[PDB]
Amino acid sequence: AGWNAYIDNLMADGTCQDAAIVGYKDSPSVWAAVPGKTFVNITPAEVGVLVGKDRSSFYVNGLTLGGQKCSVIRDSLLQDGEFSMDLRTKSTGGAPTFNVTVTKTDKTLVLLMGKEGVHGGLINKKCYEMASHLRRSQY
Amino acid sequence: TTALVCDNGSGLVKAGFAGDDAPRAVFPSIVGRPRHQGVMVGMGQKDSYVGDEAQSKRGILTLKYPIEHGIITNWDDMEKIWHHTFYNELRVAPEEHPTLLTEAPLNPKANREKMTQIMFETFNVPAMYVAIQAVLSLYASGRTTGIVLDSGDGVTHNVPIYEGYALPHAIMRLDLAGRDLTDYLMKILTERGYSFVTTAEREIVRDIKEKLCYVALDFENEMATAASSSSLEKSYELPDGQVITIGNERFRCPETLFQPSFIGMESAGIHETTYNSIMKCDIDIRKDLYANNVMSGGTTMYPGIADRMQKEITALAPSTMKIKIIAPPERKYSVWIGGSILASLSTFQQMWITKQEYDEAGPSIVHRKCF
Amino acid sequence: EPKEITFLDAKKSLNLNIFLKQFKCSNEEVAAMIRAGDTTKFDVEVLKQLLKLLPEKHEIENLRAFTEERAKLASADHFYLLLLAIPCYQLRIECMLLCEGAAA
Numbered sequence A: 001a002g003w004n005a006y007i008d009n010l011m012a013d014g015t016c017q018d019a020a021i022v023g024y025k026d027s028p029s030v031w032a033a034v035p036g037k038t039f040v041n042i043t044p045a046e047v048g049v050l051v052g053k054d055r056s057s058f059y060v061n062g063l064t065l066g067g068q069k070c071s072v073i074r075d076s077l078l079q080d081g082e083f084s085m086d087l088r089t090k091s092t093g094g095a096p097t098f099n100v101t102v103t104k105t106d107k108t109l110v111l112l113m114g115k116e117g118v119h120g121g122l123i124n125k126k127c128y129e130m131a132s133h134l135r136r137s138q139y
Numbered sequence B: 001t002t003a004l005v006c007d008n009g010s011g012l013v014k015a016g017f018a019g020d021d022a023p024r025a026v027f028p029s030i031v032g033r034p035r036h037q038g039v040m041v042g043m044g045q046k047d048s049y050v051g052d053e054a055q056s057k058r059g060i061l062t063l064k065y066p067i068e069h070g071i072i073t074n075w076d077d078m079e080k081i082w083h084h085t086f087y088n089e090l091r092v093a094p095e096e097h098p099t100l101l102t103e104a105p106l107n108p109k110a111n112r113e114k115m116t117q118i119m120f121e122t123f124n125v126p127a128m129y130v131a132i133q134a135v136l137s138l139y140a141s142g143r144t145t146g147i148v149l150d151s152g153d154g155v156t157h158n159v160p161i162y163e164g165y166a167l168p169h170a171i172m173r174l175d176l177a178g179r180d181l182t183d184y185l186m187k188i189l190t191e192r193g194y195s196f197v198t199t200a201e202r203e204i205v206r207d208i209k210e211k212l213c214y215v216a217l218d219f220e221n222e223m224a225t226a227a228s229s230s231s232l233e234k235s236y237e238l239p240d241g242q243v244i245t246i247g248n249e250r251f252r253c254p255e256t257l258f259q260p261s262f263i264g265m266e267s268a269g270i271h272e273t274t275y276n277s278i279m280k281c282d283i284d285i286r287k288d289l290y291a292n293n294v295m296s297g298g299t300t301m302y303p304g305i306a307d308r309m310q311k312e313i314t315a316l317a318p319s320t321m322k323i324k325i326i327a328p329p330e331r332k333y334s335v336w337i338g339g340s341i342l343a344s345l346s347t348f349q350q351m352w353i354t355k356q357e358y359d360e361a362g363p364s365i366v367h368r369k370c371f
Numbered sequence C: 001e002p003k004e005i006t007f008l009d010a011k012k013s014l015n016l017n018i019f020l021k022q023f024k025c026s027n028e029e030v031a032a033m034i035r036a037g038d039t040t041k042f043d044v045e046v047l048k049q050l051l052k053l054l055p056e057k058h059e060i061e062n063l064r065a066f067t068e069e070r071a072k073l074a075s076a077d078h079f080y081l082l083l084l085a086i087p088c089y090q091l092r093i094e095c096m097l098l099c100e101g102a103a104a
């Protein structure tokens, strides 16, 4: 069972519209993602934005995930106890805005893109359970 | 079932039911213990008094004001205040009413986690949501996105809100509120020639701050007519007969909000922290921040604070001639009234934190449901 | 002696006993006159003491849940259960105290 089974486990309940296991250690690339969606086009430059030491640049105009502009709300990502990253998708002209959660494991990046009207807390707890499950398995 | 809304204030804790126009209980944030030693029976006198009962018998009680500058420090006295707030002030048990709660902005995370675990373990509420006072303050005006100035009794804050969700990076703090204004008012009335060493004198100066003090449209012009104004000089009668005359100090006590250099610190004012907090956001939200600027707290009851906020935001920001700063008449309790508006709706039933969520997620659910 | 079972602390039963024993009658005459609205033995301070010893909601629910024989209870609990048999008693006690205090 590969990482596509892990994406299907992330696509089990149907609350989230996109999932991403993206490498930042060993093999820095998108290891798996939902095909056709935003997070399959995550560059390692966007990973270096995410894993970078500057925790104050991305507050000026958001950052980019898969070419999509998004706004940071919370930053507890490099902190070892929490390892969490809360974003919301920016939009132009009254287009609907979506909740985004990014987390570190030991080797991977777990990114989740939610649906319309779906609260970011459920996205956050599901991604935290996923990151804790990966960190329990030394991943 | 009707919901309960309480504003856990630094100087006045308010409590009541959802949907009510006014809070049913308004009591000061005090816990009294008996000041002298003596035991007897005396038909079962209580060991601790809270609130209006603590206010009424306060001569034989040493009081505690346990919130320091918005932030909770002593936790047992908050637990006793919350026990009074449920069990005797509203006369309820908290295990069936969902309870909306208020936090000071830039609250430490351990305070939020401790608050959530004391709600879920001790009181055992079936539903609780922590909201920033500014988000409820925007909800009393009836909108979901904008920056809000909130000055209570503890601390002044400017908080930006996006679709009901606050942005903790651009929240700014000004270290003054109505307690600091009260201390400054005793300072400049002492400089005028008076003296306030007792409890009742401090309460009289609090009521002077409640009744007489105002904000002028222009500080420099009203200084320029201060000796010549026939309507500026007010006074107050203490019930034992002392007369306190107040002049220009009526608009020097709240102008500490606008300029904190009046008292001797270099912090930015309620218009300058608002402007600097607007610029620290994303660029797109800033017009909606200016469009829905709400002041809140009892520290905004000074008449003519609306047009002075208008003139100061007009001075700093050249795009804001015509946008109006919204000042509801009931923004004493706009945290509580917005909590009533938020909790009474049928769209809020998902956003409550269940007991099982705390059991499976720990206290850190307050980081992730309350945002 | 049978055990005087009470759903209250000793303070409230003690103040209610010191209140009730000053009047020189049993609890039935007290509750029957509270129904009757007689102001002879009720001045302002007595009605203030009566409102200071009002029953709590869990105490009313415990007295309603007591379906056993009433003889084993205390006399204060007998007064509470005689008070609970009066329709709309608290508003009438408030009416009498506000009328006498208003006249005063």
Ligand SMILES: Nc1ncnc2c1ncn2[C@@H]1O[C@H](COP(=O)(O)OP(=O)(O)OP(=O)(O)O)[C@@H](O)[C@H]1O
Pocket: B007, B008, B009, B010, B011, B012, B013, B069, B070, B104, B133, B151, B152, B153, B154, B155, B177, B178, B179, B182, B206, B209, B210, B211, B296, B297, B298, B299, B300, B301, B302, B332
């Ligand atoms: N009409 C009034 N005019 C001026 N000041 C007032 C008025 N009424 C109350 N105050 C003062 O303003 C403060 C009350 O504000 P508020 O109720 O928002 O504070 P709080 O909720 O205790 O504080 P915080 O929100 O920081 O926890 C107190 O310091 C009180 O003395």
Ligand SMILES: [Mg+2]
Pocket: B007, B008, B009, B010, B012, B102, B133, B152, B335
């Ligand atoms: Mg408050």
